[PDB]
Amino acid sequence: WYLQNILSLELLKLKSKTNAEKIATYRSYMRSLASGKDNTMSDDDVIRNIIKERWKTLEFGDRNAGYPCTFGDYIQFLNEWFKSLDEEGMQRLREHFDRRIRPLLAVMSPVDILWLEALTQNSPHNKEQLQRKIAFQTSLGTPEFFDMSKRLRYEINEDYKVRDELGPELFALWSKAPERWPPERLSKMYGLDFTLVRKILVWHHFKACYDACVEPDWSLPKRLFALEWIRDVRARKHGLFYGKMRFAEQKITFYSDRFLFRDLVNRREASYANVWEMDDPYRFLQTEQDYEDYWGDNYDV
Amino acid sequence: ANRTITGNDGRFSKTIMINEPQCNQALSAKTASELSKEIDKATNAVYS
Amino acid sequence: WAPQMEWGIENTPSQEQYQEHVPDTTDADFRKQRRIQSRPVKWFYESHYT
Amino acid sequence: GGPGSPVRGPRGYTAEWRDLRNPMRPPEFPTPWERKYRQYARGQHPSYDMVYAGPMPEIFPMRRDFRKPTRWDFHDIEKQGKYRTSGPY
Amino acid sequence: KNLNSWYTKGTMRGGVPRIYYAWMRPGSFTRRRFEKMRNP
Amino acid sequence: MGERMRAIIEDYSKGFGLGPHGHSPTHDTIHYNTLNAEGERVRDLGYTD
Amino acid sequence: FRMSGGDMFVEYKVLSRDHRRSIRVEDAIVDPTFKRTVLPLGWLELLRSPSLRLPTGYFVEETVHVSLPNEANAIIAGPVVLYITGQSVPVVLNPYFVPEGTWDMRTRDGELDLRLGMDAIEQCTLFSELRPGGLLYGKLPENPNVRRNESLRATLGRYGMKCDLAESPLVPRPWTRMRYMFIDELQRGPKLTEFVGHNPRNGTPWRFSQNTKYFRIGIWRDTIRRNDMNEGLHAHSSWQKSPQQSVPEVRFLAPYP
Amino acid sequence: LGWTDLFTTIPDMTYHIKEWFDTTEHMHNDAVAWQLGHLLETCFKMKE
Amino acid sequence: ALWYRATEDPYFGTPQHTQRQAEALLKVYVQAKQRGKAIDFMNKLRGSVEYLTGDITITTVMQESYDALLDTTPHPHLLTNGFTLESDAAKYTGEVNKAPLSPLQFRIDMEMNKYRRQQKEEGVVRVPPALWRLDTSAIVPYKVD
Amino acid sequence: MEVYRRITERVRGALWAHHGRLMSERQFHRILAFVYNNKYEYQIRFDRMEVVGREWGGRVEVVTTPAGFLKRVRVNPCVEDLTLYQQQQLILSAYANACADGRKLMEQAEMNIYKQFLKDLKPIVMGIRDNPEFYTVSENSIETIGGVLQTGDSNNLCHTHRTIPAAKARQPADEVRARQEWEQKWINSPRGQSWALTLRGKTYFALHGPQYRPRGAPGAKKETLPLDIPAPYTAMDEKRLLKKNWMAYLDNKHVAEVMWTRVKIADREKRQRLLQETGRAWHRPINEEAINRW
Amino acid sequence: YKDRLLSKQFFQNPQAFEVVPDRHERSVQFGGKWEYQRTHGLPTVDRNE
Amino acid sequence: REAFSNIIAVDLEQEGPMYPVRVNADGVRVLLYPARRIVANFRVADILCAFGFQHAGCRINLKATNNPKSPTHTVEGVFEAVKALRSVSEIAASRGKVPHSLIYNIYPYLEEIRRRKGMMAMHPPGKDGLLMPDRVVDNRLPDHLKRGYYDDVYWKDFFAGSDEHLNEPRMGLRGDEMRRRLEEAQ
Amino acid sequence: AKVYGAVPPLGAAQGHRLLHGKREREGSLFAVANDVKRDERLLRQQLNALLEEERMPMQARLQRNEAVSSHEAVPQTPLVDLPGVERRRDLPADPITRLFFQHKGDHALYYGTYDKPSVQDDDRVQIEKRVPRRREENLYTPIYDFCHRIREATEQRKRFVVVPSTIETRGCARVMHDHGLVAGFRDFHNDRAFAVELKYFQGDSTINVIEPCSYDGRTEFEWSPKMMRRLLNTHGIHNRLVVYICRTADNRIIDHIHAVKENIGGRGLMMVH
Amino acid sequence: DLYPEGFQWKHKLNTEYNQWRSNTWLTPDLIPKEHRGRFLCNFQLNIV
Numbered sequence A: 001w002y003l004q005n006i007l008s009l010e011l012l013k014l015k016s017k018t019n020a021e022k023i024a025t026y027r028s029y030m031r032s033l034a035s036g037k038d039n040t041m042s043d044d045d046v047i048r049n050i051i052k053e054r055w056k057t058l059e060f061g062d063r064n065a066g067y068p069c070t071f072g073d074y075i076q077f078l079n080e081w082f083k084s085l086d087e088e089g090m091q092r093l094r095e096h097f098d099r100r101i102r103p104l105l106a107v108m109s110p111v112d113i114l115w116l117e118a119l120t121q122n123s124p125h126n127k128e129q130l131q132r133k134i135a136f137q138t139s140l141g142t143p144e145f146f147d148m149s150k151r152l153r154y155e156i157n158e159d160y161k162v163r164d165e166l167g168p169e170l171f172a173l174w175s176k177a178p179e180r181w182p183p184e185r186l187s188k189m190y191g192l193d194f195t196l197v198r199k200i201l202v203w204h205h206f207k208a209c210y211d212a213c214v215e216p217d218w219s220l221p222k223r224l225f226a227l228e229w230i231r232d233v234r235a236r237k238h239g240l241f242y243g244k245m246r247f248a249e250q251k252i253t254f255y256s257d258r259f260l261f262r263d264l265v266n267r268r269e270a271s272y273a274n275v276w277e278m279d280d281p282y283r284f285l286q287t288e289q290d291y292e293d294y295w296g297d298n299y300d301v
Numbered sequence B: 001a002n003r004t005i006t007g008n009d010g011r012f013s014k015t016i017m018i019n020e021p022q023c024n025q026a027l028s029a030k031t032a033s034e035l036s037k038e039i040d041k042a043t044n045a046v047y048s
Numbered sequence C: 001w002a003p004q005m006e007w008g009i010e011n012t013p014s015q016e017q018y019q020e021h022v023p024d025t026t027d028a029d030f031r032k033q034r035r036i037q038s039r040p041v042k043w044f045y046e047s048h049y050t
Numbered sequence D: 001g002g003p004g005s006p007v008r009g010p011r012g013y014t015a016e017w018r019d020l021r022n023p024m025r026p027p028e029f030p031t032p033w034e035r036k037y038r039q040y041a042r043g044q045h046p047s048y049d050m051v052y053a054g055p056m057p058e059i060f061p062m063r064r065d066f067r068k069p070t071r072w073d074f075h076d077i078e079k080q081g082k083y084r085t086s087g088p089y
Numbered sequence E: 001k002n003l004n005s006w007y008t009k010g011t012m013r014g015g016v017p018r019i020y021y022a023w024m025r026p027g028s029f030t031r032r033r034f035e036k037m038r039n040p
Numbered sequence F: 001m002g003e004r005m006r007a008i009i010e011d012y013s014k015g016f017g018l019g020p021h022g023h024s025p026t027h028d029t030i031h032y033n034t035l036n037a038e039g040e041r042v043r044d045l046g047y048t049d
Numbered sequence G: 001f002r003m004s005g006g007d008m009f010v011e012y013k014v015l016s017r018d019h020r021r022s023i024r025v026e027d028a029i030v031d032p033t034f035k036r037t038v039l040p041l042g043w044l045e046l047l048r049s050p051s052l053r054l055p056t057g058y059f060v061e062e063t064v065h066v067s068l069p070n071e072a073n074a075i076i077a078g079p080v081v082l083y084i085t086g087q088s089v090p091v092v093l094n095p096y097f098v099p100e101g102t103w104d105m106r107t108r109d110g111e112l113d114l115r116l117g118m119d120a121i122e123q124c125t126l127f128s129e130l131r132p133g134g135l136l137y138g139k140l141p142e143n144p145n146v147r148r149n150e151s152l153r154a155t156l157g158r159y160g161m162k163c164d165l166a167e168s169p170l171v172p173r174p175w176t177r178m179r180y181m182f183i184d185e186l187q188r189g190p191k192l193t194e195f196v197g198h199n200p201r202n203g204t205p206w207r208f209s210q211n212t213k214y215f216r217i218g219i220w221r222d223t224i225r226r227n228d229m230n231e232g233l234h235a236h237s238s239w240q241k242s243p244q245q246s247v248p249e250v251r252f253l254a255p256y257p
Numbered sequence H: 001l002g003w004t005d006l007f008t009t010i011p012d013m014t015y016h017i018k019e020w021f022d023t024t025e026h027m028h029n030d031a032v033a034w035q036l037g038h039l040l041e042t043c044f045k046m047k048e
Numbered sequence I: 001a002l003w004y005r006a007t008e009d010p011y012f013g014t015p016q017h018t019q020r021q022a023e024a025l026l027k028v029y030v031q032a033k034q035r036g037k038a039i040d041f042m043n044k045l046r047g048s049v050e051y052l053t054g055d056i057t058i059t060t061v062m063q064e065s066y067d068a069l070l071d072t073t074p075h076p077h078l079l080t081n082g083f084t085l086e087s088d089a090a091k092y093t094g095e096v097n098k099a100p101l102s103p104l105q106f107r108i109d110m111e112m113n114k115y116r117r118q119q120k121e122e123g124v125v126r127v128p129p130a131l132w133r134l135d136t137s138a139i140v141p142y143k144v145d
Numbered sequence J: 001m002e003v004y005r006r007i008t009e010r011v012r013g014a015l016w017a018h019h020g021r022l023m024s025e026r027q028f029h030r031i032l033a034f035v036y037n038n039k040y041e042y043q044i045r046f047d048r049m050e051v052v053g054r055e056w057g058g059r060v061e062v063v064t065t066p067a068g069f070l071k072r073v074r075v076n077p078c079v080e081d082l083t084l085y086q087q088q089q090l091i092l093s094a095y096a097n098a099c100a101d102g103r104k105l106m107e108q109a110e111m112n113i114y115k116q117f118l119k120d121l122k123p124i125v126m127g128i129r130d131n132p133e134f135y136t137v138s139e140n141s142i143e144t145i146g147g148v149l150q151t152g153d154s155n156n157l158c159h160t161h162r163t164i165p166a167a168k169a170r171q172p173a174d175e176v177r178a179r180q181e182w183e184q185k186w187i188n189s190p191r192g193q194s195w196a197l198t199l200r201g202k203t204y205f206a207l208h209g210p211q212y213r214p215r216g217a218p219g220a221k222k223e224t225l226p227l228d229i230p231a232p233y234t235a236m237d238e239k240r241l242l243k244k245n246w247m248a249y250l251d252n253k254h255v256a257e258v259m260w261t262r263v264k265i266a267d268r269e270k271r272q273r274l275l276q277e278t279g280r281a282w283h284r285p286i287n288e289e290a291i292n293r294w
Numbered sequence K: 001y002k003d004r005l006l007s008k009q010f011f012q013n014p015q016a017f018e019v020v021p022d023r024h025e026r027s028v029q030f031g032g033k034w035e036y037q038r039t040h041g042l043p044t045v046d047r048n049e
Numbered sequence L: 001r002e003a004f005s006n007i008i009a010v011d012l013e014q015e016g017p018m019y020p021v022r023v024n025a026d027g028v029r030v031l032l033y034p035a036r037r038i039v040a041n042f043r044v045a046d047i048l049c050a051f052g053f054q055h056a057g058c059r060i061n062l063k064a065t066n067n068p069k070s071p072t073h074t075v076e077g078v079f080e081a082v083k084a085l086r087s088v089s090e091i092a093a094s095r096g097k098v099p100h101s102l103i104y105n106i107y108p109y110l111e112e113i114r115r116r117k118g119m120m121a122m123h124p125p126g127k128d129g130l131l132m133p134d135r136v137v138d139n140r141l142p143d144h145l146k147r148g149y150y151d152d153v154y155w156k157d158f159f160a161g162s163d164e165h166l167n168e169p170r171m172g173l174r175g176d177e178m179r180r181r182l183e184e185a186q
Numbered sequence M: 001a002k003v004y005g006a007v008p009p010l011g012a013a014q015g016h017r018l019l020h021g022k023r024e025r026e027g028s029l030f031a032v033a034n035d036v037k038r039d040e041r042l043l044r045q046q047l048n049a050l051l052e053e054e055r056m057p058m059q060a061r062l063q064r065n066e067a068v069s070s071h072e073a074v075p076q077t078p079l080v081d082l083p084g085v086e087r088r089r090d091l092p093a094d095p096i097t098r099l100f101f102q103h104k105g106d107h108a109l110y111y112g113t114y115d116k117p118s119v120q121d122d123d124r125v126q127i128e129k130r131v132p133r134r135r136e137e138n139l140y141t142p143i144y145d146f147c148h149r150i151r152e153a154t155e156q157r158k159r160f161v162v163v164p165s166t167i168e169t170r171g172c173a174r175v176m177h178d179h180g181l182v183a184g185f186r187d188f189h190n191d192r193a194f195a196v197e198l199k200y201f202q203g204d205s206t207i208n209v210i211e212p213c214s215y216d217g218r219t220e221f222e223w224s225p226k227m228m229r230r231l232l233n234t235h236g237i238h239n240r241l242v243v244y245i246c247r248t249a250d251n252r253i254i255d256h257i258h259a260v261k262e263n264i265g266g267r268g269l270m271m272v273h
Numbered sequence N: 001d002l003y004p005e006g007f008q009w010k011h012k013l014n015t016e017y018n019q020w021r022s023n024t025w026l027t028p029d030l031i032p033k034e035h036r037g038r039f040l041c042n043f044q045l046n047i048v
């Protein structure tokens, strides 16, 4: 079933476009004029819709009757396949799970249980009473309000999309001499705050690495966040605990308004032979205690 | 230290007042080099 | 690395942890939420700096 | 060794005048100091303290923590009895 | 040198859950009114 | 329903840039189209060659 | 790191352990015929900074024959940090300090003929230059394990390389390994973090489910009279009236719902 | 001569600047720009 | 863990991995019927520094044991030496004698998957020339003792 | 930083003012990021060289990288006899004249950067004003709810300029294709054949042939046709936002509007100052009907 | 560059380069537990050029 | 509904009071002080748990036997106390001072102060970034002129159904597409 | 192979002790013993030096660096100046609108004490010293009623308070103004009193509570450094929120934070927050 | 941040957010007007 429906594209036929349709579509795609039909749907989107509804319309049961698969048959293939997984295989799996299932796992509700069982066409214990209960309760809202397909639809901060950060920026440069490319040069690219943009840079580096089929620098998150690293190390040594320091446990000292002046004139008057000296990753460290806190993790160093 | 320059700070505002009523507010070398400190330490402050 | 801390679930013996005697079997302690235990020598397979 | 401890006690130029030398003039034996250190030693190096560190972010999100069956989750009210179960664990 | 450990501070209430903040209070989280310039 | 209707409408229909008096439509002390003074100015003029 | 005449030249920075004292070296050969990196003996006193942890400047100070460069003709001194221009990670040598007589590299005017050995290559990204196809592979000392003149694809072909990267449809393409990247601030917001236990670190994120003894009467009263408010501990359960259940990683700052 | 834009007749202006910037709230440069600007327009520019 | 602790330990540890350690670990992987790890380890070894130095070497014993376990354990896409035929699989396969995979059909499906892939990625496929024919001459079928 | 961000906001704002197009925040910041990195490159290369300032006679010498860093100081033993104060001032003034020379260099460099930046903005800017629908009215013409009123005075003084040929479109692209047509016409001619064997010819081919760049050599390997981003004909960030969430739409259009207003206010301030400098405008409002009577 | 890159990619996983891929699972590594320090990233171009 | 009218909230950034709160409800003297954990009378305790306090500890009326003691008093006391509590941030602003916790935010600022030396500090000579309009530009065209204006750059009939870009929206259209408009009209 | 900072290449003719290795002199047990002891205490001395450089306060370091900076070869004599520039200036105040006149320091002979004040600021009422009418009553202190003045003036939301002027009282004011619990303060060199300007924020005061340490003058509380150190610690988190003021043997009025810094104990005055 | 922004998303109505995330939506009589659609939370009731 999986081979015929999902994997074989060549057997998939699409409704053929008329000539008028071909023209209107072309001229829509090449040059946009406002007020137009917002749909203009890519045959890519269409195709993927047909596939996902092929996953909708898949039902199990006796296959001497209509449907293709025994349930036992399905979980059998599933079991053979799950044992069959490599490292990056089950990595792809767990990513796929974190992206699709996991958020749904957070947004569920009793109101869905019937629908939740309609996926496998399994019959519940209480099915009539759940019919009644869920009917009465879904009565209290819009039908769009209650369907689990649409509950994830909006995401804050639409200016930077995860889809668009998949291609990492200027990867054809900082690949080739990663030392000449401190986090600053790239951080001018994003209109976000500091913690967020450094976070994003880490993700860029990792995506890039996995893309080029080489292993990523795991010391990179420690390098970009170095100040946060050392603050956490010294906090862990101070309050005795293992974890990451959170806000409640910060010192209650109140600095004066001008407290930063000394450091301000020290920074404003600094000077550097080259730009590498300006931002090297290790300028955070002076005493030996600094070097002992920064590398305590690698028993190599 | 000389009580030549004095100040008044509100939450978000800062007042630097030159006090030398005797010589008609004529700044000495020390007092001027001092004012260029109080002015930029008041001006580079966080809340001003 | 996290130092080992006393008065944990797998640390504390029965009578302090529960006021009852609970049998110590190396298999399936429901109270301790563990499925099974292979019981190697504690500091042998782990790295020493750890 | 502090303030409770026993006290330590105490025209021309002295012998402590000569050892001193201007940082403007090149010193005695030209020991290759690292610039960063001499910056830090005279107090002119821009500070990076623990005060400048924000939150340490979760970068790679761990795993889903699945519900671990406890003694208070049982489908029969009987299995959590007073004669058997004194608490979830 | 601070012998109370932040590791063990608290009282188990049994079933009673309480919230905690990873960093700041959630209300202070999205700053968009100064970011996207909606202010009087 | 009505309030967010109004919010969307007032936000989409608002003007921007500088007017004949050299200021924003939302500027603090100085105003434009007082008592439909421009509306009437179109009433009596009209647009025709 | 640059190439000329067939070999590498790297700038590096030698440093004491406390990083009090430092020396730059501009063009150093990267040569993997040296088991251990060699410096002029005179630097031993230049790099000695007697800190608190090392009352004498160095942890290790001894005499070795050191006849490899050219009976105790040299001195092993450790540990001196070394920062190479390309690399993010410091490399920590315990070098041979050689006097003038043992070996004298003055070789050209102003030029000290310093080079880097496998002491320091093992610790850098430079090490990946040591494998077949790299730029140091020619200069490895001859072995049974290292074939001198073979073409790269010949060598890797023997190790079992058949086609180009992900060329066969059976192996997934490298860049689909990571498709989605999870950043809380950019999408759906932060998690709602609760705990049952002593602290956030000592407890579980999970509340107790509906099957609890104390929750059953309450949940009952809550199913039957749905509209009025009900007393109980049944509030603390993972299950409740509202369509939004309490389970870990609820995104509560998300616009929808 | 256009050496400066600002002029005022108000007694003890300095106090009023202080107390005005006490009632102000945020540090975002939108806010700062408006607070400073409103101060200037209402007093130091001679509109009325 | 032991293999890491071999170079990590100050007191009992060796500076570089001895050959003894290598062939020992390999022997564990052979004796665990552990395929993936044996392959990856072998390749990692021949990519190490000790290998390039000449210190660790792949011997004939390691080599042939490696091959032994490579034969006798299940391969993901293919039938392996030391896969036992099942008489009763005829219930499904349709035949009692032969092996339940045909390398020819496997190759063909590989070609098909190659085109399906080029389509999934570029949205369009180049039609092969008329002089193009799949070369099946190099394929041999499964032999069974 | 400032001079750039002002112009970029000019572009973004204008882009939404004239046509209904929004620029993606992503894009807006990545322009600036490119300027920044340009400056950074110029810095990288600027530190390989040194500038020498010199004070009295030649007897105080200061060697400093153009960024203002100090590398060497040479001094006559004459100086050693002065005073600590005067020694300090002397060296400090040499350092100053060094920083002067360096800063002259850097400012040429920066002019160069500004030019490259403009050249990179040009397909966008000339993207918005080179369309058959684009227009402007004079800033002194009254605007009323129907449309814009006519400025009365000096019917000679208003001249409408037109950037577009009114007959069939000749786009910049046709001009570049014309340029390479003339390149080939010149090359393939007999006199051009003899010229391609000169030093001038091979300088031309080394700089401006990309086609002959060996595989793996830095730089573009084809000649590129000039980018065409016609503003009213290309949907950019408003269509994606309108499909996804209305709220982000309203916020981004709001940002563009605000930026445009701000730019316009700046232009009014500069105009006012230039008007005051030449004495046509007073220093406080003397005409209040120009404000209060609307 | 293409060869330095090729080699690094190959010693990352060999199973990317096989026409019929065998099981690819991570094993131990010879440099240490921190071996990524001596391995990672992409081959680097000489800085002069 | 009287309890929802009186709802209070608590800033949990600090997770418990950072100073002692000494406050009396009517006749009931209450002390809310910082503790290692939650310590209180069972009822007061799960009231303080209702706020999400980890580190608070609280006592009502010295000795527990002290008058007046009612269930009412026990509740009203702890709620009154909590309602008198000041958050640390609020205290810090109250004195016109910067909290130790919020200083990290200044870091990027302070960072590019340090990094502004050299070219990054440099501005283009001659150019302010403020470019005033001088002339008036209008490229608009009569419809018949733009009918075939973009035929070479793009396809013929470029402006076809475009309502904003044409004074005659229906020109250039083939009959079918003209019919479509009316078709949706009726 | 170009080398920077390494001074003449290959140094100059210096062999190590172990490498050169001249034949070891045989010292009598005397010589050897003495070598061992002098070089042992040489190492001890060095360890001391390093610890002292580690523990040096920043102010000390700055004074040192800028002292060396100005250092000349000859120790030059001070130059004769104007008749004086160095009179401490009088702090500015307005004569016409006043709490009190700012009295010149040039009049320092005219001044009285807190007990027997010289006639000045006649136009203003004079605060009276607060003393007990009978035996059982507490014996009041300028600190006691300083705190209660401020507390009551904070409850009535007043801008200015006239308050008793003694050494530790205006000490307390300077400390409170440091921490920003008080808008400002001034001593006019009026004998009896001086004035404090209160600060309000968000509609209530900046001062929650302000309390004196002792009710009597007959009771004097001494604060151990460990106690003042306990205050700073809220179950493992450093708390400077509350301020405690105290006298030192050195007659300084300090908060508990500076006291803990230099590890000195002091006598308690008041708490405020 | 004394007066934080809080929850700013208008994609649903206040009453729809309230409905989904809060049990308080089920008891409209027990809540005053100022808090009506304003709560996203579940409340426990304890009768003393």
Ligand SMILES: [Mg+2]
Binding pocket: A262, A263, D043, D044, M058
């Ligand atoms: Mg300092």
Ligand SMILES: [Mg+2]
Binding pocket: L065
């Ligand atoms: Mg009683």
